[PDB]
Design a protein around this ligand. Structure first.
Ligand SMILES: N[C@@H]1[C@@H](O)[C@H](O)[C@@H](COP(=O)(O)O)O[C@@H]1O
Ligand SMILES: N[C@@H]1[C@@H](O)[C@H](O)[C@@H](COP(=O)(O)O)O[C@@H]1O
Lengths: 243, 242
């Protein structure tokens, strides 16, 4: 199934870890069928069982796999439940679940309003708009890519210390008005080459494409954001009623 | 670029229609850009413009393309906005959009409860559970595949006429109580070969996978459902507050 090249300078255990990772990334491994045994892998490739064991144990310690006594070794399927109706920040979302939020700046641009953005935000035109594009990390694992358009006057000058923490925190502080309401539009999608590369997932893997338009308590729109969320680590939850 | 085969029994305009359809299907030509002109198509394939015009006009009449004056012909992107917070039936969703809801039965089985299903539904074990798997149609265009699990006692015996109609309407009538509340779980997915073939979309095309547990006004769960919705024809909407 996988491919081991003994002539390569990459150690065999490392090859196994990487190829199993690539297999989980590619969907090639069912999540609750057991992995091939140490024996099966070792015989298949003509390598030591201890080499196989080294790889599998490392993967367990990285949480990508888990052992069930008497049943074998299984692919981990960690998925966070994300509530759709509570208006929150990524930073709030992560801290609530005891994980450390982070960000890496993909791109920052101050841009001229378009008439389309101006219609969405109800902001001036012509005006200047922050365009803040970040990958959002949970314990240094990329979870999403978000591109947030915010009218300049609702945020003022921004620097790397804003980008590396919570934009919503800054928005409330800077405007002295809390964040109160949003509208979101959800669409399933396949990760583009670039999205996959930044997210560490396979090209074309399932992502949820989300557009959010977010409002201050005085009813001013301060954000129009377009984001892609990793399908493989998220479950989006909401409720419904007749009203 | 398309592949026109003039030795084929299939008429050229029909090829153009089908290959354009396939191209839209496979997301191969941008929805914001205008198609190549009548002339460009004709000159590329060494065919008559009138053949091209026949194919494009047909596709306009089918609503797959549209003509913007002076700018060109464009790929239509019919989106239907689906509100996530309002508990409704497919039948209700369509009617309120002035469209005709239909269903095609994929499979019906009356099945034994499992400890897993009984936990979800709070139903009896062992008991019988309806398992109703249908294609849901909007004016004869497939929109979703749904597999609904419903405890026998909350629905009684069902036949093909129930399947072709609204299950939710039956449920409220049978139980003399309104359908009141639900929890849904959402995740994006790629359409399986089977899901794609039934939905008329490309293998691997984006779909929304949705699990619904649905409750009657008295707190009784009556449905556990697993569905896939075509990503291309839906926009799911909800609101948020603090
Ligand atoms: N999907 C939203 C984004 O639309 C928003 O821009 C972000 C701000 O998060 P933070 O305040 O941590 O910068 O929160 C969520 O993730
Ligand atoms: N997603 C829901 C399904 O979970 C539900 O089973 C169906 C019933 O629709 P109907 O009453 O038309 O049969 O409505 C929607 O489509």
């Amino acid at each position: 199934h996988m491919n081991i090249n003994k002539q390569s300078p990459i150690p065999i255990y490392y090859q196994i870890m990487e190829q199993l990772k690539t297999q989980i990334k590619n969907g090639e491994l069912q999540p609750d069928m057991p992995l091939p045994s140490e024996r099966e892998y070792a015989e298949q490739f003509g390598i030591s069982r201890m080499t196989v064991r080294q790889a599998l144990s490392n993967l367990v310690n990285e949480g990508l796999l888990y052992r069930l006594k008497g049943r074998g070794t299984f692919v981990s399927k960690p998925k966070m439940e994300q509530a759709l109706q509570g208006l929150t920040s990524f930073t709030e979302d992560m801290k609530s679940r005891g994980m450390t939020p982070g960000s890496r700046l993909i791109d920052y641009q101050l841009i001229d309003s378009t008439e389309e953005l101006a219609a969405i935000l109800g902001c001036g035109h012509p005006s200047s708009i922050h365009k803040i594009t970040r990958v959002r990390l949970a314990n240094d694992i990329p979870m999403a890519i978000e591109s947030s358009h915010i009218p300049f006057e609702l945020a003022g000058e921004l620097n790397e210390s804003h980008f590396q923490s919570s934009i919503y925190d800054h928005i409330e502080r800077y405007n002295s008005i809390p964040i109160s309401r949003a509208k979101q539009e959800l669409e399933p999608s396949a990760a583009t080459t670039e999205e996959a590369n930044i997210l560490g997932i396979q090209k074309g893997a399932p992502v949820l494409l989300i557009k959010r338009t977010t409002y201050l308590q005085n009813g001013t729109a301060f954000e129009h954001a377009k984001s892609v969320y990793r399908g493989d680590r998220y479950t989006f939850v909401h409720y419904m009623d007749r009203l």
